[PDB]
């Protein structure tokens, strides 16, 4: 007779170990899962920083490409002006 | 005399070059950073998405387990319940 | 006469200053496609260590996910084997 | 005595759903990780196609930037040359 309450008692056991065991697994996942989305907050916000930044730089880009095309405005309209003074200089010794 | 002349068109035309195959290099350069940051914009939406989800995933792993555990509990106190009424029996039975 | 010689001035002092700025715009895109490259490649190297890590997990894993199920195995037949105990014990009792 | 019965009837029916309700979290956290892990993955190939591009693009930036600095000799040396030619012809009329 004992030989059941023996056999209540292996199945208390069973139970509680395979239930400690799942809870385990389950942690394990869950802390899985936990570092991963971390993760890519991380680099979610790596990328914001940085995208953010980039409308300072086009301005600045801006700023010195504007700069740039007037100092080659005035390369061209130099150079322009030169060979014109040349080709007057050049008939009046034709003369 | 057309030296001068001349010499002054090779300016021009070097200046010219010069200036449009820079012009491609950065183009090039622009184009690079602007197809970078689209491929980090989409992988940051996509995280975006992810992290959106997780919180109802969440609630609905939440509603599970709660149900697991009250089973838990449940089996638990059977087995207990169980061993009892047999401990009970036994007794009868030594009488 | 040192119209010209003044002005050939200026085409130089205009050519070397918009040369410079340009290299400057160069360098700093440049730079800006280097630093993007480089976290692209830290994050890579990240999922690089998770997904290797992964592998290890899924043993250790597989490991216990067959305990787990060998202990509900052992919980089953144990229930059943003292389901059938009883209904031996009640028979007998009907005697 | 039919109690001891039921109650183990019972004990079983309560396992069974427990055990099978914790597979399925188990397998939905699993499936999770796997869909994550997938991200990771694709995310990390293409930084990988990204960068491998990079070297090949760096080929072409140098030869383009080669010639960039081969004109801007050429410019400076013209430019000097006009000049060193007009201090010529400056003194020649000086006379």
Chains 1, 2, 3, 4 share one sequence.
Do not use: F, T
């Not at 004992?2 to 239930?19: F, R």
């Amino acid at each position: 007779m004992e030989n059941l309450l023996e056999e209540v008692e292996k199945a208390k056991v069973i139970a509680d170990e395979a239930v400690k065991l799942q809870k385990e697994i389950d942690k394990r996942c869950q802390h899985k899962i936990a570092e991963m989305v971390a993760l890519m907050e991380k680099h979610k916000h790596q990328y914001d920083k940085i995208i953010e930044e980039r409308d300072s730089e086009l301005g600045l880009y801006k700023s010195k490409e504007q700069e740039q095309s007037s100092l080659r405005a005035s390369l061209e309209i130099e150079l322009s002006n030169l060979k014109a003074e040349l080709l007057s200089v050049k008939k009046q010794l034709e003369i």
